[PDB]
DNA sequence: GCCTTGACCCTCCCCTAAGGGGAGGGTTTAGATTGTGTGCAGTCTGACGCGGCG
C-alpha cells in the first residue's frame, strides 16, 4: 500500500492510498520429503553449525 | 606425449610407421610461459 | 552451547531479507521523486533483485 | 596531514576534490563572466589583426549569395534575425574602410582600438572564433620560430651573449644595421657570426612579407599575441575554477551508475569530461543555474561511456538502447503477468518482429571468465575443459601423408605428360593449381588438348588397375 | 587439399555439406532405451516423433 | 593416337528504378540536485624480514 500524505498538514494526513498486490519473486518449495527441486535436480540445503 | 605440438604428430606417424623414435621439440607450455613473462615487461630469452 | 544450528528456513530468510533491502533502497530512491501522484506500488518494486 | 595513510585512488580523489568549496548562484555568474571576459579579450586582441575581420567580412559576403546561413557565423549580439546583422556588418565595414587609408604614428593607433571595440559586439560562434585565433597563432608561431632560429643561428657559430643580442634585434627589422654593430663588438664570437650573415638573409628578410602582409609589424602583433595568451589563459583558469567546484555534482550523478560494468572512478572520470564540456557550453545569461545544464552533459558522458566500454564484446549504442528497452518492457510484463514473458508475447508488448527479439536476447549475455571455478571447486576452472578445436587429429595427419604417398604412387603410374597435367591441374607438389590455359601455355598447347589429356588421365586412374589404393580413402 | 581434390575428381564421390554431429552411446555402455523426451522451442515445427 | 578449332556452356559478379530498411555513428537535451556505500568481510597460523621507534 502506497500512502501519499498531504503537502501542508499537521500530521501529513492521507492524500491518497493505493493498495495493490505486487509480485516479488518466486520462492522455492520444499517437497514433502525435505528436498528442493531446483533446475530439475533435487537439492538438499544442509544445516549449518556456526 | 603431452605438449610438443609438432612432436606429438611425428611420434604418432612414427609409431604407425613402426619406427619408435621421437623428435622432441620444446613443450608448448614453456613457450606460453615465456610469452607470459615477456608480457610483464621482463625480457626472458633463449641464448643460442 | 556456543555453536548453533542455522537451518534451511533461517538461511533462506536471511537471503530473502538481503533481497528485500536491495529492493527497498531502490524504492526509497524512487519514492523521493516528483511523479508521486500517478504511480502504483507495483511500478516501483523490482522483483528481479529479490 | 592525512597524506600517506591510504593508497586507494578513490579515497585520494575524494580527499583532494573536497578541498574546493562549492559555488553559490552568484558565484557561477561571476566565473562565467570571467570566462566570457577572457574570450572577448582575446577577440578584441585579434581584432588588431585586420585580415581577421576581412575574413569575417568575406564570410558575410559568402552569406550574401547563400554559401552559408547567418546562424553559422554569429550566434547573437551584445552591447536571431538577419534584420540587424546587415547594419552590424555595415558598422564593422565602415570602421574597416576608415581604418584602411590611415598610415599615421600615434594617429593610427587609436583607430585599431575603435575597430576592436566595435568588433566586440559580435558574439561569434566557436567555429569562426577558433579559426581566427589558431590562424594568427600559426602565423606568429612560424615567424616566431623564425625569430628563434635567427637567435640559434648564432649558436651554430659560437656561444654568444643574448642579453647584448636582444637590445639590437628589435625595432629595425628591415635591415642589418642592428647586425652591423655586431662586428663593432668584435669579441671572438662575433667573428664566426658574420660568415653566416648571408644564409640569415633569406630568413631575416622573409618576415618582411608579413611586415606588410598583416599591415602591422612584428613587435605590435607580438604584444597582440602576448595579450592573446593573457586573455586565453585568463579564460582557461576561470573554466578550471568552475570545473573544480562542481566535481561533487559528477559524483552525485555517477553514484547512480555504479554497478553497470564500469568502476566508480571510470564513471566519475567520464562525468568529469562531460562536466568540462558543460562548462564550455554554459550560458549564464539564460538565467539558469549551472546544475541544470551540467547534469545533462554529465549524464550524457557517463551513459555514453557505459555503452561504449562496459562490455567485452562491444555492442553499439542502438543495440544497447534496444536491450535496455527490452529489459524494461520485460520487467513490466513480469510484474503484470506474474511470470517471465516468453519472447512471443514480448514481441507484442514491444512492436518488433519476434526473431528480432530472439536475437536481441541472444546478444546481451556477457562472456564467462575462463577462470571461474566449476561448482566452486577452486581446483577446477572453466578454462581447462575447453578443447582446441582447430587442430587436426594425428590420425588425420597420418591419413593425409598416406594419401600423399598413394597419390605419388598412382601419378608415377602415369606418363610424364599426364602426371604434369595432373600435378598442375590440381595443386599437387606445387604451391598453386592452374587453369587449362596456364597449363596449356606451359606446353604451348591450346586449352582443349589439355582438357583431353586430363580427361584421359582421369579415365586411366579410374580403372581397376590403379584405383584400389585410392578408393580406400573414401569412407563408406 | 590438392590430393583430396584429385581423389574426388577421380571417383566423383563429392563432399557433403553437412557434418555428422549425432548423439551416440558412450563406449562400453550397453543398455535399453526406456524413454525418449523431445523438447521443441515454440516456433520450430515438430517432427513425426515429437 | 596428337593436336586444333569454332561453337557452346557454366558460374559468378555487377548492373538496372526509385527509393526502403536497417546498422552504426555523430549531436544536444537550460527548473534544480554538489563526498561511494555492501544491512560487505572482518574469522589462519607461523616464520621471517624489515622498518619506525624509543
Coordinates of C-alpha atoms in Angstrom, one line a residue, chain D:
Chain D
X1 CA 48.0 15.9 7.2
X2 CA 46.4 12.6 6.2
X3 CA 49.0 12.2 3.4
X4 CA 50.4 8.7 3.2
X5 CA 47.8 6.8 5.2
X6 CA 45.9 5.4 2.1
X7 CA 46.7 4.1 -1.3
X8 CA 43.1 3.8 -2.6
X9 CA 42.7 6.0 -5.6
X10 CA 39.1 6.8 -4.8
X11 CA 39.9 8.0 -1.3
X12 CA 42.7 10.1 -2.7
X13 CA 40.4 11.6 -5.4
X14 CA 37.6 12.4 -2.9
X15 CA 40.1 13.9 -0.4
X16 CA 41.7 16.1 -3.0
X17 CA 38.4 17.1 -4.5
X18 CA 36.8 18.2 -1.3
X19 CA 39.3 21.0 -0.8
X20 CA 37.3 23.1 -3.3
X21 CA 34.3 24.9 -1.8
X22 CA 31.1 24.9 -3.9
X23 CA 29.8 27.9 -5.7
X24 CA 26.7 29.9 -5.0
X25 CA 24.2 31.1 -7.5
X26 CA 26.1 34.4 -7.9
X27 CA 29.5 32.6 -7.9
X28 CA 28.8 30.8 -11.1
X29 CA 27.7 34.1 -12.6
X30 CA 31.0 35.7 -11.6
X31 CA 33.0 32.8 -13.0
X32 CA 31.1 32.8 -16.3
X33 CA 31.6 36.5 -16.5
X34 CA 35.3 35.9 -16.2
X35 CA 35.3 33.2 -18.9
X36 CA 33.4 35.5 -21.3
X37 CA 35.7 38.4 -20.3
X38 CA 38.7 36.2 -21.3
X39 CA 37.2 35.2 -24.6
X40 CA 36.1 38.8 -25.6
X41 CA 39.6 39.9 -24.5
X42 CA 41.2 37.5 -27.0
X43 CA 38.6 38.7 -29.5
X44 CA 39.4 42.4 -29.0
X45 CA 43.1 41.4 -29.3
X46 CA 42.8 39.6 -32.5
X47 CA 40.7 42.4 -34.0
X48 CA 44.1 44.2 -34.1
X49 CA 44.9 41.8 -36.9
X50 CA 42.7 43.2 -39.7
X51 CA 42.8 40.3 -42.0
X52 CA 40.7 38.6 -39.4
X53 CA 37.8 40.9 -39.8
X54 CA 38.3 40.9 -43.6
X55 CA 37.9 37.1 -43.4
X56 CA 34.7 37.5 -41.4
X57 CA 33.5 40.2 -43.8
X58 CA 34.1 38.0 -46.9
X59 CA 32.4 35.2 -44.9
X60 CA 29.4 37.5 -44.8
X61 CA 29.9 38.1 -48.5
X62 CA 29.6 34.3 -48.8
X63 CA 26.4 34.6 -46.8
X64 CA 25.3 37.2 -49.4
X65 CA 24.9 34.5 -52.1
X66 CA 23.8 31.7 -49.7
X67 CA 27.1 30.0 -49.2
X68 CA 26.1 29.7 -45.6
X69 CA 23.4 30.8 -43.2
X70 CA 23.7 33.5 -40.6
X71 CA 23.5 31.1 -37.6
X72 CA 26.8 29.5 -38.7
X73 CA 28.8 32.7 -38.3
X74 CA 27.2 34.8 -35.5
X75 CA 25.2 33.4 -32.6
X76 CA 24.0 36.8 -31.2
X77 CA 24.7 40.4 -30.4
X78 CA 25.5 42.1 -27.1
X79 CA 26.3 45.8 -26.4
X80 CA 18.2 35.6 -34.4
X81 CA 17.1 37.8 -37.3
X82 CA 19.1 38.9 -40.4
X83 CA 17.5 42.3 -39.9
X84 CA 20.1 43.7 -37.5
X85 CA 23.2 41.9 -38.9
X86 CA 23.1 43.8 -42.1
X87 CA 23.8 47.1 -40.3
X88 CA 26.1 45.2 -38.0
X89 CA 28.4 44.2 -40.8
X90 CA 27.9 47.7 -42.2
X91 CA 29.2 49.0 -38.8
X92 CA 32.3 46.8 -39.0
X93 CA 32.8 47.6 -42.7
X94 CA 32.6 51.4 -42.2
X95 CA 35.2 51.1 -39.4
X96 CA 37.4 48.9 -41.6
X97 CA 37.3 51.2 -44.6
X98 CA 38.0 54.2 -42.4
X99 CA 40.9 52.4 -40.7
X100 CA 42.4 51.2 -44.0
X101 CA 43.7 54.5 -45.5
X102 CA 45.3 55.8 -42.4
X103 CA 49.0 55.0 -42.1
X104 CA 49.7 57.6 -39.3
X105 CA 52.4 57.0 -35.6
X106 CA 50.1 57.9 -32.7
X107 CA 47.5 58.9 -35.3
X108 CA 46.9 55.3 -36.5
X109 CA 47.0 53.7 -33.0
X110 CA 43.5 54.6 -31.7
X111 CA 41.7 53.6 -34.8
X112 CA 42.7 50.0 -34.1
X113 CA 41.1 50.0 -30.6
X114 CA 38.0 51.6 -32.1
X115 CA 38.0 48.7 -34.5
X116 CA 38.3 46.2 -31.7
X117 CA 35.6 47.7 -29.5
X118 CA 33.2 47.9 -32.4
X119 CA 34.0 44.3 -33.2
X120 CA 33.4 43.3 -29.6
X121 CA 29.6 43.5 -30.4
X122 CA 29.8 40.2 -32.3
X123 CA 29.0 37.1 -30.3
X124 CA 31.0 34.8 -32.6
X125 CA 30.3 31.0 -32.9
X126 CA 33.2 28.8 -31.7
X127 CA 33.9 27.8 -35.3
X128 CA 35.0 31.1 -36.7
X129 CA 36.5 32.4 -33.4
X130 CA 38.7 29.3 -33.2
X131 CA 39.6 29.7 -36.8
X132 CA 40.9 33.2 -36.4
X133 CA 42.7 32.5 -33.2
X134 CA 44.5 29.4 -34.4
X135 CA 45.3 31.2 -37.7
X136 CA 47.0 34.1 -36.0
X137 CA 48.6 31.6 -33.7
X138 CA 50.2 29.6 -36.5
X139 CA 51.2 32.8 -38.3
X140 CA 53.2 34.3 -35.4
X141 CA 54.3 30.8 -34.3
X142 CA 56.0 30.2 -37.7
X143 CA 57.5 33.7 -37.8
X144 CA 58.4 33.3 -34.1
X145 CA 60.3 30.1 -34.5
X146 CA 61.8 32.0 -37.4
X147 CA 63.0 34.6 -34.8
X148 CA 64.1 31.8 -32.6
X149 CA 66.2 30.2 -35.3
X150 CA 67.6 33.7 -36.1
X151 CA 68.9 33.6 -32.5
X152 CA 70.1 30.0 -32.7
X153 CA 71.8 30.7 -36.0
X154 CA 74.4 32.2 -33.7
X155 CA 74.6 29.0 -31.5
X156 CA 76.0 27.1 -34.5
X157 CA 78.6 29.8 -34.9
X158 CA 79.6 30.4 -31.3
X159 CA 78.2 30.8 -27.9
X160 CA 77.0 34.3 -27.5
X161 CA 75.6 37.0 -25.2
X162 CA 71.9 37.2 -25.8
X163 CA 71.3 40.0 -23.3
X164 CA 73.6 42.1 -25.6
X165 CA 71.8 40.5 -28.6
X166 CA 68.3 41.4 -27.6
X167 CA 69.0 45.1 -27.4
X168 CA 69.8 45.0 -31.2
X169 CA 67.3 42.8 -32.8
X170 CA 64.1 44.6 -32.0
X171 CA 62.8 47.6 -34.0
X172 CA 64.9 47.8 -37.1
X173 CA 63.6 44.6 -38.6
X174 CA 64.1 45.6 -42.3
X175 CA 67.9 45.7 -42.4
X176 CA 71.1 44.5 -40.9
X177 CA 72.1 47.8 -39.3
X178 CA 71.3 46.0 -36.0
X179 CA 73.6 43.3 -37.3
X180 CA 76.3 45.8 -38.4
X181 CA 77.1 46.7 -34.8
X182 CA 77.7 43.0 -34.0
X183 CA 81.1 43.4 -35.7
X184 CA 81.6 46.7 -33.8
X185 CA 81.7 44.3 -30.8
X186 CA 84.3 42.0 -32.3
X187 CA 84.7 39.7 -29.4
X188 CA 85.8 36.2 -30.9
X189 CA 82.2 35.0 -31.1
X190 CA 81.1 37.9 -33.4
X191 CA 83.8 36.8 -35.8
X192 CA 82.1 33.5 -36.7
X193 CA 78.6 35.0 -36.7
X194 CA 79.2 37.3 -39.7
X195 CA 80.2 34.5 -42.0
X196 CA 76.6 33.2 -41.9
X197 CA 75.2 36.7 -42.5
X198 CA 74.3 35.5 -46.0
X199 CA 72.2 32.4 -45.0
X200 CA 70.4 34.5 -42.4
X201 CA 69.3 36.9 -45.2
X202 CA 66.5 34.8 -46.6
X203 CA 65.3 34.3 -43.1
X204 CA 65.8 37.9 -41.8
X205 CA 64.1 39.5 -44.8
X206 CA 61.3 37.0 -45.4
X207 CA 59.2 38.0 -42.4
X208 CA 59.4 41.3 -44.3
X209 CA 56.5 40.0 -46.2
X210 CA 54.4 39.7 -43.0
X211 CA 55.8 43.2 -42.1
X212 CA 53.4 44.3 -44.9
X213 CA 51.1 41.3 -45.1
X214 CA 49.1 42.0 -41.9
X215 CA 49.6 45.7 -42.2
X216 CA 51.3 45.5 -38.8
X217 CA 54.9 45.0 -37.8
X218 CA 56.1 42.0 -35.8
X219 CA 56.5 43.8 -32.4
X220 CA 52.9 45.1 -32.5
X221 CA 51.4 41.7 -33.2
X222 CA 54.0 40.4 -30.8
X223 CA 52.2 42.3 -28.0
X224 CA 48.9 41.3 -29.6
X225 CA 49.9 37.6 -29.3
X226 CA 51.0 38.2 -25.7
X227 CA 47.7 39.7 -24.8
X228 CA 46.1 36.9 -26.7
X229 CA 47.8 34.5 -24.4
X230 CA 46.9 36.6 -21.4
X231 CA 43.2 36.5 -22.4
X232 CA 43.0 32.8 -23.2
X233 CA 44.9 31.8 -20.1
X234 CA 42.6 34.1 -18.2
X235 CA 39.6 32.2 -19.6
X236 CA 41.3 28.8 -19.0
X237 CA 42.0 29.4 -15.3
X238 CA 38.4 30.5 -15.0
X239 CA 36.9 27.4 -16.6
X240 CA 39.1 25.4 -14.3
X241 CA 37.7 27.2 -11.3
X242 CA 34.2 26.3 -12.4
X243 CA 35.1 22.7 -13.2
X244 CA 36.9 22.0 -9.9
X245 CA 34.0 23.4 -7.9
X246 CA 31.4 21.2 -9.4
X247 CA 33.2 17.9 -9.1
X248 CA 30.7 16.7 -6.5
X249 CA 27.9 17.0 -9.0
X250 CA 29.7 14.4 -11.1
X251 CA 29.9 12.1 -8.1
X252 CA 26.3 12.5 -7.1
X253 CA 25.4 11.6 -10.7
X254 CA 28.0 8.9 -11.1
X255 CA 26.9 7.0 -8.0
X256 CA 23.6 6.3 -9.8
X257 CA 25.6 4.3 -12.4
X258 CA 27.8 2.2 -10.3
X259 CA 27.5 -1.5 -10.9
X260 CA 26.7 -1.3 -14.6
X261 CA 30.1 -2.6 -15.8
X262 CA 32.4 0.3 -15.1
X263 CA 34.4 1.0 -12.0
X264 CA 33.4 4.0 -9.9
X265 CA 36.4 6.1 -10.9
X266 CA 35.9 5.3 -14.6
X267 CA 32.4 6.7 -14.3
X268 CA 33.5 9.8 -12.5
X269 CA 36.3 10.5 -15.0
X270 CA 33.8 10.3 -17.8
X271 CA 31.5 12.5 -15.9
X272 CA 34.4 14.9 -15.4
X273 CA 34.9 15.1 -19.2
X274 CA 31.2 15.7 -19.6
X275 CA 31.3 18.4 -17.0
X276 CA 34.2 20.1 -18.8
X277 CA 32.0 20.2 -21.9
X278 CA 29.2 21.6 -19.8
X279 CA 31.4 24.4 -18.6
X280 CA 32.5 25.1 -22.2
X281 CA 28.9 25.3 -23.4
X282 CA 27.3 27.2 -20.4
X283 CA 25.5 30.5 -20.9
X284 CA 24.8 32.3 -17.7
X285 CA 22.7 34.9 -19.5
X286 CA 19.9 32.3 -19.7
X287 CA 19.4 32.9 -16.0
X288 CA 19.6 29.2 -15.2
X289 CA 21.7 27.5 -12.6
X290 CA 24.8 25.6 -13.6
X291 CA 23.5 22.3 -12.2
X292 CA 20.6 22.1 -14.7
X293 CA 22.8 22.1 -17.7
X294 CA 25.8 20.3 -16.3
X295 CA 23.6 17.4 -15.3
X296 CA 22.6 16.9 -18.9
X297 CA 26.2 16.8 -20.1
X298 CA 27.4 14.6 -17.2
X299 CA 24.6 12.1 -17.7
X300 CA 25.4 12.0 -21.4
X301 CA 29.1 11.4 -20.9
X302 CA 28.6 8.7 -18.3
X303 CA 25.9 6.8 -20.1
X304 CA 27.9 7.0 -23.3
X305 CA 30.9 5.5 -21.7
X306 CA 28.8 2.8 -20.2
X307 CA 27.5 2.0 -23.6
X308 CA 31.0 2.0 -25.2
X309 CA 33.3 0.4 -22.7
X310 CA 31.4 -1.7 -20.2
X311 CA 31.1 -4.8 -22.4
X312 CA 33.9 -7.2 -23.5
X313 CA 32.4 -7.7 -27.0
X314 CA 31.1 -4.2 -27.7
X315 CA 27.5 -3.7 -28.9
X316 CA 26.6 -0.4 -30.4
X317 CA 24.5 2.3 -28.8
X318 CA 21.5 1.4 -30.8
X319 CA 21.6 -2.2 -29.6
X320 CA 22.4 -1.0 -26.1
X321 CA 19.2 1.0 -26.2
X322 CA 17.2 -1.8 -27.7
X323 CA 18.5 -4.2 -24.9
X324 CA 17.6 -1.6 -22.3
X325 CA 14.2 -1.1 -23.7
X326 CA 13.6 -4.9 -23.8
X327 CA 14.7 -5.3 -20.2
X328 CA 12.4 -2.5 -19.1
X329 CA 9.5 -3.9 -21.0
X330 CA 10.2 -7.4 -19.7
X331 CA 10.3 -6.2 -16.1
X332 CA 7.0 -4.6 -16.6
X333 CA 5.5 -7.7 -18.1
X334 CA 6.9 -9.8 -15.3
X335 CA 5.2 -7.6 -12.8
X336 CA 1.9 -7.7 -14.6
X337 CA 1.7 -11.3 -15.8
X338 CA 3.3 -12.7 -12.7
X339 CA 5.8 -14.7 -14.7
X340 CA 8.6 -14.3 -17.1
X341 CA 7.3 -13.1 -20.5
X342 CA 8.0 -15.5 -23.4
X343 CA 9.6 -13.8 -26.4
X344 CA 6.5 -14.3 -28.4
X345 CA 4.3 -12.1 -26.1
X346 CA 7.3 -9.9 -25.6
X347 CA 7.1 -9.3 -29.3
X348 CA 3.6 -7.9 -29.0
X349 CA 4.3 -5.8 -25.9
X350 CA 7.1 -4.3 -28.0
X351 CA 6.3 -3.8 -31.7
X352 CA 9.3 -5.7 -33.2
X353 CA 9.3 -9.0 -35.1
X354 CA 9.7 -11.9 -32.9
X355 CA 13.0 -13.2 -34.3
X356 CA 14.5 -9.8 -33.8
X357 CA 13.7 -10.0 -30.1
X358 CA 15.1 -13.6 -30.0
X359 CA 18.4 -12.4 -31.4
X360 CA 18.4 -9.3 -29.2
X361 CA 18.0 -11.8 -26.3
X362 CA 20.9 -13.8 -27.7
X363 CA 23.1 -10.8 -27.8
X364 CA 23.1 -9.5 -24.3
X365 CA 25.0 -12.3 -22.4
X366 CA 28.5 -11.3 -21.1
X367 CA 31.4 -13.7 -21.5
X368 CA 32.2 -16.0 -18.7
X369 CA 35.7 -16.0 -17.2
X370 CA 37.8 -18.9 -18.2
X371 CA 38.9 -19.0 -14.6
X372 CA 35.5 -19.4 -13.0
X373 CA 35.6 -22.3 -10.5
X374 CA 33.2 -25.0 -11.7
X375 CA 30.9 -26.0 -8.8
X376 CA 33.1 -23.6 -6.7
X377 CA 35.7 -26.3 -6.6
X378 CA 38.6 -23.8 -7.0
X379 CA 40.8 -26.6 -8.1
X380 CA 39.0 -27.0 -11.5
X381 CA 38.3 -23.9 -13.7
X382 CA 36.3 -23.5 -16.8
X383 CA 39.3 -23.0 -19.0
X384 CA 40.7 -26.4 -18.6
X385 CA 37.6 -28.0 -20.1
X386 CA 37.9 -26.1 -23.3
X387 CA 39.5 -28.1 -26.1
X388 CA 41.5 -26.8 -29.0
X389 CA 39.1 -27.4 -32.0
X390 CA 41.4 -26.1 -34.7
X391 CA 44.0 -28.9 -34.5
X392 CA 43.8 -31.9 -36.8
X393 CA 43.8 -35.3 -35.3
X394 CA 47.1 -37.2 -35.8
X395 CA 45.1 -40.0 -37.4
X396 CA 44.0 -37.4 -40.0
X397 CA 47.6 -36.2 -40.3
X398 CA 48.8 -39.7 -40.8
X399 CA 45.9 -40.2 -43.3
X400 CA 47.0 -37.1 -45.3
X401 CA 50.6 -38.2 -45.5
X402 CA 49.4 -41.7 -46.6
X403 CA 47.2 -40.2 -49.2
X404 CA 50.1 -38.1 -50.4
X405 CA 52.2 -41.3 -50.8
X406 CA 49.3 -43.1 -52.6
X407 CA 48.8 -40.2 -55.0
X408 CA 52.5 -40.2 -55.7
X409 CA 52.3 -43.9 -56.5
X410 CA 49.3 -43.5 -58.8
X411 CA 50.8 -40.5 -60.5
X412 CA 54.1 -42.3 -61.1
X413 CA 51.9 -45.0 -62.7
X414 CA 51.3 -42.5 -65.5
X415 CA 53.3 -40.8 -68.2
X416 CA 55.3 -37.7 -67.5
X417 CA 52.9 -35.5 -69.6
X418 CA 49.8 -36.7 -67.9
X419 CA 51.4 -36.6 -64.5
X420 CA 52.5 -33.0 -65.2
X421 CA 49.0 -32.1 -66.4
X422 CA 47.5 -33.5 -63.2
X423 CA 50.1 -32.0 -60.9
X424 CA 49.5 -28.6 -62.4
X425 CA 45.7 -29.0 -62.8
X426 CA 45.4 -29.7 -59.1
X427 CA 47.9 -28.2 -56.8
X428 CA 49.9 -31.4 -56.2
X429 CA 53.5 -30.8 -55.2
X430 CA 53.0 -27.2 -56.1
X431 CA 52.0 -24.0 -54.3
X432 CA 49.2 -23.4 -56.8
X433 CA 46.8 -25.0 -59.2
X434 CA 46.4 -23.8 -62.8
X435 CA 43.7 -23.2 -65.3
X436 CA 43.6 -25.1 -68.6
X437 CA 45.1 -22.0 -70.3
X438 CA 48.0 -21.7 -67.9
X439 CA 48.8 -25.4 -68.2
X440 CA 48.5 -25.1 -72.0
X441 CA 50.8 -22.1 -72.1
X442 CA 53.3 -24.2 -70.2
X443 CA 53.1 -26.8 -73.0
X444 CA 52.5 -24.3 -75.9
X445 CA 49.1 -26.1 -76.5
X446 CA 45.6 -24.8 -76.6
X447 CA 43.3 -25.5 -73.7
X448 CA 41.1 -28.2 -75.1
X449 CA 44.1 -30.6 -75.7
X450 CA 45.0 -30.1 -72.0
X451 CA 41.4 -30.8 -71.1
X452 CA 41.6 -34.0 -73.2
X453 CA 44.9 -35.1 -71.6
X454 CA 43.4 -34.5 -68.1
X455 CA 40.3 -36.4 -69.0
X456 CA 42.1 -39.4 -70.4
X457 CA 44.4 -39.5 -67.3
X458 CA 41.4 -39.4 -65.0
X459 CA 39.9 -42.2 -67.1
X460 CA 43.1 -44.3 -66.6
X461 CA 43.2 -43.6 -62.9
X462 CA 39.6 -44.7 -62.6
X463 CA 40.5 -48.2 -63.9
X464 CA 40.7 -51.2 -61.5
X465 CA 44.4 -51.3 -62.4
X466 CA 45.3 -48.2 -60.4
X467 CA 42.4 -47.3 -58.2
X468 CA 42.3 -49.9 -55.4
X469 CA 45.0 -48.0 -53.5
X470 CA 43.0 -44.7 -53.8
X471 CA 39.4 -45.9 -53.3
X472 CA 40.3 -47.0 -49.8
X473 CA 40.5 -43.3 -48.8
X474 CA 36.7 -42.7 -49.4
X475 CA 34.7 -43.6 -46.3
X476 CA 31.8 -45.9 -47.0

